[model samples]
Target: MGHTMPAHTPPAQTAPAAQKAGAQALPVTVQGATVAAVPPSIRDTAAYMTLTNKSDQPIKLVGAATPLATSPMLMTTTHSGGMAGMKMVPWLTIPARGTLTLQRDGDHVMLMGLKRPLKVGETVNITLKATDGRTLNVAATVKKNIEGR
Candidate 1:
């Protein structure tokens, strides 16, 4: 599960001052974060989680960070002409009082160039970045890979 790495890393963006204030007042929660274990020869893996927006306003998931991999990207699976493909998503919007679920064969956090092989029962830390300057720290357990379509 190895792929060509991006030529350059994307720079992190900072939320605006006003948005930071709003983000502080209304934060998002990360639930059931988990990383799928990969074969010993694999250099990449995916992470799944659910994001709940408890605030009255909408929030956008802009970025992700994890020390377990050299690059963590926001990606989505798509189908065209009966072929499945993976695409990079710049941001994902979570409506007010809404929920976003990242699962197998759908949206996911792509962890590339893993520093070490993931083993079952191990835990990893992931930091999700929001457009409003909010960061949600999640601890995900390593688990078996889900069967995908």
Candidate 2:
């Protein structure tokens, strides 16, 4: 997206061959997708997974959506005084050739506004959006929370 360049100083090398290969491709891999089951009274839940960046450059997880939540947020978990809280953030970055794990009390996808109570073993589909104009769909199964913290 280098649209504007100073006329005075021109770039000698315009080898944009790499960009032509895959500018919109999201080089990421998703694994172990799981959605924590919430109680009947709660209208929110969290989805955990491992995101692996397959490219040489880091990629950002910008946004996501699921049928279970009217507003799904990308949040980061904060730990203070033995109590953990979630803070909504803009995006989560996956390092180049590295992996980011979304687990309990960590960075995860906060699914809010549940249409109905989530049942264990039920599969939930989540569409994850990346900064490079690419989306990856992950099917996460609802699981009972055993980590009572």
Candidate 3:
């Protein structure tokens, strides 16, 4: 018998420093925000994070903005029709008392036309906008690139 590889593999990275301690006292908290460092030739990259919703109502992740890229898009990978590809989504919903995880080979924030090369150990600031008029400012650390899932 042969073992088959899983369709999705979680990102090989550590959680954000704050999240490692305890849950934040907020309706929505962003944790484990990370962006892998890529070669200078690569003008685009993906960001991963965990969005925790503590509210009693669903929250929609309307969009995200960052100075590092010209356009920050919410995208999801699909294996439909036997072809793997990415599709841009208008928004992602975080259920009340639940979490939405953006990881490799799944849903993620795509940063296009990077302003500059992201170096390891550097931090990128991102402002996430929600449908309920809430904004989350997150500091994502840049790390070495890991194999794609």
Candidate 4:
């Protein structure tokens, strides 16, 4: 009779969102991330890198952020006839078993609202987020310029 007096159900085991975010090792890798050191007159700059996604599912880069700047955005250099300008895009896809190579003249991660000037050889870390709740942290070097390349 005492054993039947009370019966309780166990709580479900669910990981917190923060824990879940850290659970999965990032399935993406960044190679040769670089940014050109520009004059203070230019408040914004773009970062280029090769994003290789090794996972089976494609990863969508939704946004980027860093302490060196106010915020980051996804953009692409759209060409129309003889004119060229940067257009803000919602996201960029890194195909599975493939890579999204960001060229300075093509799709890139735009860093806006620089707090201070950057010099060559300085390292900046950018935190990039994916639509699937994953983040890739990358440290890129500031170079004189890649125009030669």
Q: Give the whole-model CA lDDT for all candidates, comma-separated.
A: 0.64, 0.65, 0.64, 0.63
Error of 3 at 120 (Å): 0.9
Q: Which residue pairs show collisions in model 4?
A: none
Assess the local accuracy of residue 136 in candidate 4 as a C-alpha lDDT between 0 and 100: 74
What C-alpha lDDT does candidate 2 achieve relative to the native structure?
0.65
State every prediction's TM-score relative to the real structure: 0.65, 0.67, 0.67, 0.65
Query: For residues 18-96, what per-residue lDDT tens digits would candidate 3 score against the true structure?
Result: 3442444466764757876663447777776666666546667676688787878777653321113466777566556
What range of 10 consecutive residues in model 2 has the weakest lDDT sum? 77-86
lDDT score, candidate 3, position 15:
35
Per-residue lDDT of 130 in model 4: 76
What number of backbone clashes does candidate 4 have, counting pairs of residues 3 or more apart or in separate chains? 0
lDDT of 4 by residue, 1-149 (tens): 64443231212333334444434644666476787676344777777666665554666768677777675767665332111345666666655543555656666677767777787889988777778786778787876465545
lDDT of 1 by residue, 74-102 (tens): 76653311113466666556556535556
The residue ranges of model 4 lying beyond 4 angstroms of the native Cα positions read 1-26, 39-41, 77-85
| Per-candidate RMSD, Å | 16.9, 10.0, 14.2, 10.1
Q: Candidate 2's residue-wise lDDT over 1-149, tens digit each?
A: 25555431333444334444444544676475787787444667777676665565666767677777787877765331111445777766655654656665576777766777777889978787877777878787888566444
Instruction: State, as a TM-score between 0 and 1, how close model 1 is to the true structure.
Output: 0.65
Assess the local accuracy of residue 74 in candidate 1 as a C-alpha lDDT between 0 and 100.
71
